[PDB]
């Protein structure tokens, strides 16, 4: 059950959707992509901090969940409870298979 993302790191296939033809995919562990004071008006927060990926790879939904939580705990620690709006801007749509062996 481990199947560490070593196997499924590189992009190596034609992008699957959750389609009419692939059914029953396990739901991505990450589900909610906005954290913090996400009702804020634009005039409030004049600073946007990005994060760009410098490698062509695949990122796992499980990893996205861990990352989002880990980056929210610290920034709650510093800024506060209504000090930010963390918005994951990437979405897991490309499913991956696993060939069970006997």
């Amino acid at each position: 059950g481990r199947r560490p993302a070593r196997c499924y790191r590189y992009c190596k296939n034609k992008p699957y959707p959750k389609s009419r033809f692939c059914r029953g995919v396990p739901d991505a562990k990450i589900r909610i992509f906005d954290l913090g004071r996400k009702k804020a008006k634009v005039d409030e927060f004049p600073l946007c901090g990005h994060m760009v990926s410098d490698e062509y790879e695949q990122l796992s939904s499980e990893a996205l969940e861990a990352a989002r939580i880990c980056a929210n705990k610290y920034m709650v620690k510093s800024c506060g409870k209504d000090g930010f709006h963390i918005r994951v801007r990437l979405h897991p749509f490309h499913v991956i298979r696993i060939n069970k062996m006997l």
């Binding site: 199947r3 499924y8 790191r9 992009c11 959750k18 692939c22 059914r23 995919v25 396990p26 739901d27 991505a28 996400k38 804020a40 008006k41 634009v42 005039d43 927060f45 004049p46 600073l47 946007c48 901090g49 990005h50 994060m51 760009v52 990926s53 410098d54 490698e55 062509y56 790879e57 695949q58 990122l59 796992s60 939904s61 499980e62 990893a63 990352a67 880990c70 980056a71 610290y74 920034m75 510093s78 800024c79 000090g83 930010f84 709006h85 963390i86 918005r87 994951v88 801007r89 990437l90 897991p92 749509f93 490309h94 499913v95 991956i96 298979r97 696993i98 060939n99 062996m101 006997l102």
Partner: protein, 102 residues
């Protein structure tokens, strides 16, 4: 399984990145410059490989650029409405509303 017709079945769900993608954008008050990158650098340790971090040249999650954005808002070509700001060209049929009050 025994390779006599091996083909996997859905399991997990990933997302594909691109060199220059933006996996996470945090918005906050400018005072939090060294809280943003400080916290966000943790995500570099949850994701595989290396991801350059970065501070945006834009007001927020807007299409726009450095704070001449707010000058443009004063000109009323940008309407603060919601988590983003709504663009306004000078086209459109309200050539009486732009008269009555632009």
């Amino acid at each position: 399984t025994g390779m006599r017709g091996a083909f996997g079945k859905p399991q997990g769900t990933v997302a594909r990145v691109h060199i220059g993608q933006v996996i996470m954008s945090i918005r906050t008050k400018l005072q939090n410059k060294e809280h943003v990158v400080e916290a966000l650098r943790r995500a570099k340790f949850k994701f595989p490989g290396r991801q350059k971090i970065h501070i945006s040249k834009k007001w927020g999650f807007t299409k726009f650029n450095a704070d001449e954005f707010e000058d443009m808002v004063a000109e009323k070509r940008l309407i603060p409405d919601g988590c983003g700001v709504k663009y306004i060209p000078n086209r459109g049929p309200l050539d009486k509303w732009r008269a009555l009050h632009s």
